[PDB]
Amino acid sequence: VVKMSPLPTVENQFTPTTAWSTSVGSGIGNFYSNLHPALADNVVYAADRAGLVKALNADDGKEIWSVSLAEKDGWFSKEPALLSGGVTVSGGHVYIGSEKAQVYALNTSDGTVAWQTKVAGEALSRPVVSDGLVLIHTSNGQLQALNEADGAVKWTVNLDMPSLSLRGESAPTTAFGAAVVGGDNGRVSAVLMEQGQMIWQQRISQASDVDTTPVVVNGVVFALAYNGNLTALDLRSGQIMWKRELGSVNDFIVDGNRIYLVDQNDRVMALTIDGGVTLWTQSDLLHRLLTSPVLYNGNLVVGDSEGYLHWINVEDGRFVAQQKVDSSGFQTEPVAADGKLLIQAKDGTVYSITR
């Protein structure tokens, strides 16, 4: 039976530290969630499941504003918002989706609610903003586009039915006028941003916690099937270029001519971008329950359920550094942007990390 690997013994090549940390409510606790922080213009925006949202100065982590989104929703005077998908920031708005099928847009200036919209299903995946439009993929197989200005639904597209409960985020992505979205039925779809016109669909499944969010790089769509297989598709046609039948893949990123991934057992691998030949596999974190990986200052970084960050050399998969950060553990994604590394612990605490 599976068991967590021991903490690796690492001779630190450098000594990473915590720049600052700041509480954000009660976080996500032991609930599954995709909720993570956003960074824009030297401000960190982060939230908890209950409904608290904070803006923090990115240099010291001090609160700039806060807002509680919990509202009355029945007999009792207050109920949690169940914030899930997000946080996303664009154009002076902070966007967050909820398990109660609400999407909120907050002003970056002061945290006040600009608009709130009832969407077709649970909004468990991050809002994605493109061309004055907030794309929401609901857990119900719906893709909806909301106007950035007033939150009205401009168009809705049916991807397949809601009868399954796949753990794993499924955000849309956009490329050159089109949205591309994965799913639970094993199909990837491309639709035009203009009015939701379907361009193509492709099946990548046949017949666990997989992020089915597609990644488009230089005219190629990279996508995980709900069972963890990695496939590359032609962006224009949806034609399958290759498929790599790994027993499973949970999370991946694409950089240069490589794909870096974390599988269902927490092995970390580098593959070639063209056909994903396996350059190296690092298995010393087996069953430690990793986050998605990010690249930061040229290293691959992942967090684990015990609250460590692990820094990995992309050339050979070796560890170059290890740091203990937060005892409540790490489950959502680390965020690497604007020269900073941010990550939110399960109890809600947000960290900025210094290489």
Swiss-Prot record:
It is found in: Cell outer membrane. One of its GO terms (molecular function) is identical protein binding. It is a lipid-anchor. GO terms for biological process: Gram-negative-bacterium-type cell outer membrane assembly; protein insertion into membrane. Its main location: membrane. PANTHER family: CELL SURFACE PROTEIN, OUTER MEMBRANE PROTEIN ASSEMBLY FACTOR BAMB. Belongs to the BamB family. Part of the outer membrane protein assembly complex (Bam), which is involved in assembly and insertion of beta-barrel proteins into the outer membrane. Nonessential member of the complex, which may orient the flexible periplasmic domain of BamA for interaction with other Bam components, chaperones and nascent outer membrane proteins. Efficient substrate folding and insertion into the outer membrane requires all 5 subunits. Part of the Bam complex, which is composed of the outer membrane protein BamA, and four lipoproteins BamB, BamC, BamD and BamE. Monomer. Interacts directly with BamA. The Bam complex has the shape of a hat, with the BamA beta-barrel crown in the outer membrane and the periplasmic brim formed by the BamA POTRA domains and the 4 lipoproteins. This is Outer membrane protein assembly factor BamB. It comes from Escherichia coli (strain K12). The lineage of its organism: Bacteria, Pseudomonadati, Pseudomonadota, Gammaproteobacteria, Enterobacterales.
